[PDB]
């Protein structure tokens, strides 16, 4: 029969299309494997950085509490010191005045 090569040509075209699509599929498989691998890598990085951040925040909380306490202690100590100095000076002047008062009052 005359028409065998018509069929063989059309089959050849279909075969070419199939083979291209199979190659494409292999490429897409590799590409998806690379991408998924990336998703896992960046996911891991993200989570680890969450934990590092959280520990940093907690550490900050602790040290800021310590600082607040230290500032309160410094404030109170400075107030006590200022009171001591002021009272020393006042009592110095006043007491010298008492000595005068006594030497003159005796007369």
């Amino acid at each position: 029969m005359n028409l065998e090569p018509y069929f063989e040509l059309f089959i050849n075209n279909l075969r070419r299309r199939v083979d291209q699509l199979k190659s494409d599929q292999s490429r897409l498989d590799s590409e998806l494997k690379n991408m998924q691998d990336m998703v896992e890598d960046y996911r891991n990085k993200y989570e680890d950085e969450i934990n590092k951040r959280t520990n940093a925040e907690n550490e900050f909380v602790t040290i800021k509490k310590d600082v607040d306490g230290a500032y309160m202690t410094k404030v109170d100590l400075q107030a006590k010191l200022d009171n001591l100095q002021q009272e020393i000076d006042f009592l110095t002047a006043l007491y010298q005045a008492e000595l005068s008062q006594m030497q003159t009052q005796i007369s």
């Binding site: 199939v18 960046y42 951040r53 600082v67 202690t73 410094k74 010191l81 008492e98 006594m102």
Partner: protein, 104 residues
């Protein structure tokens, strides 16, 4: 003819093989796309994380410097308070004793 029938069978098998391959490859491409968006999304989230951590840690170091300064100051003030306390007590008792002396 019969032979032509066989050729027909192969033709249709290739047609369906095409359909299957196109569909499958399309689904895989969608998987690749969504996975892309997920990787990019995770990198943005991560970047935000390193920013927050950046601010936190820097602030921490600053607060370490402050804490050291405050502790040193505290010790200094305690020393000064001690000295001035001894001095005040001396002053008071000395003046009182002098009073006693002059009155006698």
């Amino acid at each position: 003819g019969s032979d032509y029938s066989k050729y027909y069978k192969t033709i249709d098998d290739l047609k369906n093989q095409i359909l299957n391959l196109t569909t499958d490859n399309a689904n895989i491409l969608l998987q690749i796309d969504n996975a892309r968006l997920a990787a990019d999304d995770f990198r943005l989230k991560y970047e935000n994380e390193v920013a927050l951590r950046q601010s936190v840690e820097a602030d921490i170091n600053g607060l370490r410097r402050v804490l050291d300064e405050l502790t040193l100051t505290k010790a200094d003030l305690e020393m000064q308070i001690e000295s001035l306390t001894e001095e005040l007590a001396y002053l008071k008792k000395n003046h009182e004793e002098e009073m006693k002396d002059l009155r006698n």
